[PDB]
Design a protein around this ligand. Structure first.
Ligand SMILES: O=C(O)c1cc(O)c(O)c(O)c1
Ligand SMILES: O=C(O)c1cc(O)c(O)c(O)c1
Lengths: 270, 270
């Protein structure tokens, strides 16, 4: 891999080790729900510090973006590079003790995905990719599935909003209803980055979600493109990071899933 | 532990080793669609034989009822024991290469759940219980969560039915709609056994599903009861194993989920 992807990978590993070590005290701390959520914010910030420290040791002039910290611009040539970091994808799973969550690290050069790490530290699954270098899971070269249609497909989605609102719920369930009929299953495991990784690995045949922020999609999107898959927003265009709505799949199941949800979209998602 | 639970646990381990070894040859699947389902049948039958050989080595007079093999009756005093086995719960996940599935073994004495093992061989998480001894995860005592209401709750569910048409999905989504309300999330992960285990561990606050077979509910239902939790069918009665509909939770989330679904059941599930 590129030295840059190796540094992203090593960062993701250190953060995942700290997050992994952090899940034990939760069931002990879980008795105070608000104090438990405060603790998870603190674990997330410790994970962000671990990632940023490792990245900035190799590239102190790069720009960095996170949910909480926002955009910190670079300097010189480094102004062109942007690290998009989600230190813990699947915070609801994490607070409940559900072992399915991940560190997510993307590197963008002039707005285009260059490098991606999605790291499951419980299963110790390291998903990696660089633009034009392909995708891998623990060093095994990854490829999207061969499935030709939604019949007998396994699809993923989520509902990533921090409150259950009826407009988002109605539109979400409209699409869900329309998408059940044929599939071998529909999966809601609760971490967008792992869903996109699973499409890249051939474990899922397609994935769709709206309401996502860039840090939840960026790495998974490169994994899927480098796996020979397709990624778009709900209009079929390439602004999934900016719009928050994404369809990702193998080529055929991507097209069928994108076409299937259009009749159910409000103009908001068009 | 009791020798009988130890034998259950050892059998679950050997089947998990075989299923784990069987996931590597998949190369995250998509070989031939038709060949893949047959492979799953082969893996499941090999695993059921591995479990049954350990069960009959220790207890040759016990009755045994498997997902593959169906019901084989016992003899003498052994006739009082029924082993209810799913050698691989989460077959659709397994065939796609999604690493979330479990071996599930219950033992019933005179109609009553007596022993339970649910084993996740990827995360190597061994959930165990005997009537009156409590439940454990890798030997560590389990207790259902403290959450007092469905507000910020995490729910588990699934809908394995695929009819020619969307009627049965409609009734399922009637229940789903009524249950979203104030919840933090719902999960659709593909293995009922692990969802009931997750209620028993405090990882889910409650769970509901209909169309389930006994071998997928039996072990998880004892895990929940021994974790201080509640199990019933969709009417609030205790015919979940026979009817295929089940609600499991901590005290308050079990009651609130039971209350919320009552108006939304079809006469099918009364
Ligand atoms: O219940 C859901 O719709 C759901 C809940 C979540 O908290 C979540 O992250 C997800 O991806 C889906
Ligand atoms: O078919 C099943 O055993 C099943 C299907 C699901 O959609 C699901 O979430 C689950 O826990 C189990």
């Amino acid at each position: 891999m590129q030295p840059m992807l190796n540094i992203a990978l090593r960062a993701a590993r250190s953060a995942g080790e700290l997050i992994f070590r952090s899940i034990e005290r939760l069931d002990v701390i879980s008795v105070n729900e608000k104090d438990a959520k405060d603790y998870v914010t603190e674990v997330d910030r410790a994970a962000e510090q671990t990632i940023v420290a490792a990245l900035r040791k190799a590239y102190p002039t790069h720009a960095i973006m996170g949910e909480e910290g926002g955009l910190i611009e670079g300097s010189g040539e480094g102004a062109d590079y942007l690290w998009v970091i989600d230190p813990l994808d699947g915070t609801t799973n994490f607070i409940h003790g559900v072992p399915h969550f991940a560190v997510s690290i993307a590197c963008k050069y002039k707005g285009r995905l260059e490098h991606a790490v999605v790291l499951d530290p419980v299963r110790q699954e390291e998903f990696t990719a660089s633009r034009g270098r392909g995708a891998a899971l623990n060093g095994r070269r990854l490829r999207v599935s061969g499935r030709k249609s939604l019949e007998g497909a396994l699809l993923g989605t989520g509902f990533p909003f921090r409150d259950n609102q009826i407009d988002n719920l109605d539109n979400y369930l409209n699409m869900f209803r329309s998408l059940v009929g044929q599939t071998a299953g529909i999966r809601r495991a609760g971490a967008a980055s792992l869903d996109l990784a699973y499409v890249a690995a051939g474990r899922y045949d397609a994935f769709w979600e709206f309401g996502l922020s860039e840090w939840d999609m960026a790495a998974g999107a490169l994994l899927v493109q480098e796996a020979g898959g397709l990624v778009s927003d709900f209009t079929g265009s390439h602004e999934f990071l900016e719009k928050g709505h994404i369809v990702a799949g193998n080529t055929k199941c991507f097209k069928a899933l994108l076409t299937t949800i259009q009749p159910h979209l409000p103009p908001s998602l068009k």
